[PDB]
Design an enzyme around this catalytic site. Structure first.
Site, PDB file in Angstrom:
ATOM      1  N   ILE A  47       2.655 -19.760   7.402  1.00  0.00           N
ATOM      2  CA  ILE A  47       3.687 -20.415   6.587  1.00  0.00           C
ATOM      3  C   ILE A  47       3.694 -19.858   5.162  1.00  0.00           C
ATOM      4  O   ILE A  47       2.672 -19.864   4.511  1.00  0.00           O
ATOM      5  CB  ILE A  47       3.425 -21.977   6.450  1.00  0.00           C
ATOM      6  CG1 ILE A  47       3.129 -22.660   7.786  1.00  0.00           C
ATOM      7  CG2 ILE A  47       4.564 -22.696   5.712  1.00  0.00           C
ATOM      8  CD1 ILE A  47       4.361 -22.735   8.628  1.00  0.00           C
ATOM      9  N   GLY A  98       5.704   6.362  -4.745  1.00  0.00           N
ATOM     10  CA  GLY A  98       6.084   4.933  -4.614  1.00  0.00           C
ATOM     11  C   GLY A  98       6.486   4.590  -3.180  1.00  0.00           C
ATOM     12  O   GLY A  98       5.788   5.023  -2.215  1.00  0.00           O
ATOM     13  N   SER A 113       4.960   7.568   2.361  1.00  0.00           N
ATOM     14  CA  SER A 113       3.875   8.528   2.345  1.00  0.00           C
ATOM     15  C   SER A 113       2.665   8.126   3.174  1.00  0.00           C
ATOM     16  O   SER A 113       1.947   8.902   3.784  1.00  0.00           O
ATOM     17  CB  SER A 113       3.488   8.853   0.888  1.00  0.00           C
ATOM     18  OG  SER A 113       2.874   7.706   0.298  1.00  0.00           O
ATOM     19  N   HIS A 157       0.837  -1.201   0.000  1.00  0.00           N
ATOM     20  CA  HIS A 157       0.000   0.000   0.000  1.00  0.00           C
ATOM     21  C   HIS A 157       0.890   1.277   0.000  1.00  0.00           C
ATOM     22  O   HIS A 157       0.407   2.300  -0.522  1.00  0.00           O
ATOM     23  CB  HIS A 157      -0.992  -0.066   1.164  1.00  0.00           C
ATOM     24  CG  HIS A 157      -2.010  -1.166   0.949  1.00  0.00           C
ATOM     25  ND1 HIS A 157      -3.334  -0.954   0.759  1.00  0.00           N
ATOM     26  CD2 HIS A 157      -1.831  -2.532   0.895  1.00  0.00           C
ATOM     27  CE1 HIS A 157      -3.980  -2.100   0.594  1.00  0.00           C
ATOM     28  NE2 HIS A 157      -3.084  -3.050   0.657  1.00  0.00           N
TER      29      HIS A 157
HETATM   30 CA   LIG Z   1       0.356 -20.142   3.665  1.00  0.00          CA
HETATM   31 CA   LIG Z   2       3.880   5.782  -0.912  1.00  0.00          CA
END
Ligand SMILES: [Ca+2]
Ligand SMILES: [Ca+2]
Ligand code: HEM
Ligand SMILES: *[C@@H]1O[C@H](CO)[C@@H](O[C@@H]2O[C@H](CO)[C@@H](O)[C@H](O)[C@H]2NC(C)=O)[C@H](O)[C@H]1NC(C)=O
Ligand SMILES: *[C@H]1O[C@H](CO)[C@H](O)[C@H](O)[C@H]1NC(C)=O
Ligand SMILES: *[C@H]1O[C@H](CO)[C@@H](O)[C@H](O)[C@@H]1O
Length: 343
Positions: free
Chosen positions: A199, A66, A70, A47
Site C-alpha cells: 500500500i 540519467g 543504461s 538506480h
Molecule cells: Ca506502505
Molecule cells: Ca542511467
C-alpha cells in the site's frame, strides 16, 4: 487518437504502449499486483535515473546519462556496482520485454515503474512520458547512494544529480512505502520497510519514527539499524533522515497527510524519470497508465500498528509534535516478508 484496441489517447504514438501494458500486467506483475516485481521495478527507476553528474562532467569525465536505460543496456557493468546489488535479476526480468516490444530501455524502465505504482492502492495517478534515447555509455560508479552514507553525502548527491533539494529527497523516499530488502540481512530476503508494503501510504514515515528496539533477523549488517517492529527492517539513511534537523519536519509532514504524500510523489517521480532529458522533446503518454486504486477499507490513513503507541515515537520535528494517531487493536504482529521474484 483512437488506438487499435478501441481506447483513446492524446497522441497516437502512445497506442503501442497498450500492448506493453497488457503484457507486463499479466507476465511481469502476476495480474496487476503490487508485489515483489512491482517493488523491484520502482527501485530500478531510481538506480537508472540518479546516475547523472554535472559535477563529474565539469571535471571533464562522463557523469552518466540519467534516465537513459543504461543500467539495462550496460547491466554487466552497472549491476556489479555495490549500490545496485540485486538489480541484475530485475534487469534480467525486464530485458526480454524491451526486446520484444521494440521500445527503448529507458522508456520501458520509466513505464514499468509507473505501472508498478498504479497497481499499489493509494498511489498517485502516475505520469509517463516517452522519448529516452538508448544510453550512450554505462554510468560510472559512486552515483547511487548507499544505506550507510551520511545525510550530508546524500543531500550533496541529489543536489548534484538534479538540483533536487533536501525536501524533495524526503519525497522520493516515499517509494520505501512499497518496498522490501533482500540483500542487507544475509539471513533473510524480503523484510519490508513498512508494515504495508502493498500500500502506497505514510506507514513508512510513521514506523521509521519509532524508537529502534530490535533487529528483525541478524545484527551487525552494514547500513542496517534497529527497527521497532518484528519483521520490519530499518536502514541507517532512513533512520537518520527521520531524525536530522534538516529533514525531520518534512519526514513527519506525511504522517496522516495523504494528499501531500500523493501530490509530492507524483511530482518527484516524474522529475526522476526526466533526468538527463529535455521535457520539451518528450511525448506525454500518461493516459496509457491505469487509474490508481484507493486504499481499501475505511480505517484512518495513518495509524500506529497493533502494539505500538505514541510513546514509542522518537520526536525529532522541533516545530510540530507527532500527530495523535489511533492504535489498531490487537496484539503485535510480525510484518510478513515478501519473497523476491523467483527467477
Ligand atoms: Ca506502505
Ligand atoms: Ca542511467
Ligand atoms: C538515499 C537514497 C536511498 C537509499 C540509500 C536507499 C536504499 C535502499 C536499500 C538498501 C534497499 C534494499 C536493496 C536490496 O536489499 O537489494 C532499497 C530498496 C528499495 N528502494 Fe531505495 N534507497 C534510496 C532511495 C530510493 C528512491 C528515491 C526510490 C524511488 C524509486 C527507491 C525505491 C526503492 C524500492 C521500491 C525498494 C524495494 C525493492 C524491492 O522490494 O525489491 N529507493 N533501498
Ligand atoms: C497536508 O499538507 C498540505 C501541504 O502542506 C497542507 O495543505 C496546506 O495547509 C496549510 C496550513 O494549514 C496552508 O497554509 C496551505 O495553503 C495548504 N495547501 C498547500 C497545498 O500548501 C494540509 O494542511 C495538510 N493536510 C493535513 C490533513 O494536514
Ligand atoms: C511542523 O509540521 C506541521 C505540519 O503538519 C506544521 O506545518 C509546522 O509548521 C511544522 N514546522 C516546521 C518546523 O516545519
Ligand atoms: C515475524 O514473523 C513473520 C512470519 O509471521 C516473518 O515474515 C517476519 O520476518 C518476522 O520474523
Amino acid at each position: 487518437a483512437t488506438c487499435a484496441n478501441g481506447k483513446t489517447v492524446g497522441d497516437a504514438s502512445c497506442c503501442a504502449w497498450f500492448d506493453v501494458l497488457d503484457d507486463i500486467q499479466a507476465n511481469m506483475f502476476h495480474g496487476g499486483q503490487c508485489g515483489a516485481e512491482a517493488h523491484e521495478s520502482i527501485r530500478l527507476v531510481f538506480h537508472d535515473s540518479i546516475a547523472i553528474s554535472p559535477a563529474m562532467e565539469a571535471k571533464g569525465k562522463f557523469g552518466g546519462g540519467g534516465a537513459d536505460g543504461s543500467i539495462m543496456i550496460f547491466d554487466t557493468i552497472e549491476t556489479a556496482f555495490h549500490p545496485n546489488i540485486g538489480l541484475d535479476e530485475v534487469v534480467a526480468m525486464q530485458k526480454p520485454f524491451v526486446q520484444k516490444h521494440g521500445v527503448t530501455p529507458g522508456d520501458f524502465i520509466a513505464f514499468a515503474g509507473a505501472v508498478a505504482l498504479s497497481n499499489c492502492p493509494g498511489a498517485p495517478q502516475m505520469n509517463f512520458f516517452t522519448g529516452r534515447k538508448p544510453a550512450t555509455q554505462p554510468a560510472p560508479d559512486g552515483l547511487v547512494p548507499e544505506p550507510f552514507h551520511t545525510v550530508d553525502q546524500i543531500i550533496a548527491r541529489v543536489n548534484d544529480a538534479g538540483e533536487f533539494d533536501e525536501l524533495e529527497l524526503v519525497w522520493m523516499l516515499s517509494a520505501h512505502s512499497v518496498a522490501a530488502v533482500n540483500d542487507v540481512d544475509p539471513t533473510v530476503q524480503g523484510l519490508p520497510f513498512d508494515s504495508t508494503p502493498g500500500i502506497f501510504d505514510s506507514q513508512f514515515f510513521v514506523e521509521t519514527q519509532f524508537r529502534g528496539t530490535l533487529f528483525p533477523g541478524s545484527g551487525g549488517n552494514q547500513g542496517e539499524v534497529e527497527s521497532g517492529m518484528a519483521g520490519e527492517i530499518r536502514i541507517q539513511t532512513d533512520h537518520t533522515l527521520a531524525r536530522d534537523s534538516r529533514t525531520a519536519c518534512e519526514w513527519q509532514s506525511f504522517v496522516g497527510n495523504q494528499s501531500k504524500l500523493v501530490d509530492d510523489f507524483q511530482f518527484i517521480f516524474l522529475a526522476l524519470t526526466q533526468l538527463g532529458q529535455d521535457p520539451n522533446a518528450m511525448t506525454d503518454c500518461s493516459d496509457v497508465i491505469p487509474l490508481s486504486k484507493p486504499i481499501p477499507g475505511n480505517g484512518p490513513f495513518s495509524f500506529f500498528p497493533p502494539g505500538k503507541s505514541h510513546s514509542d515515537i522518537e520526536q525529532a520535528c522541533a516545530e510540530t509534535p507527532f500527530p495523535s494517531l489511533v492504535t489498531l487493536p490487537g496484539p503485535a504482529t510480525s510484518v510478513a516478508r515478501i519473497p523476491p521474484h523467483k527467477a
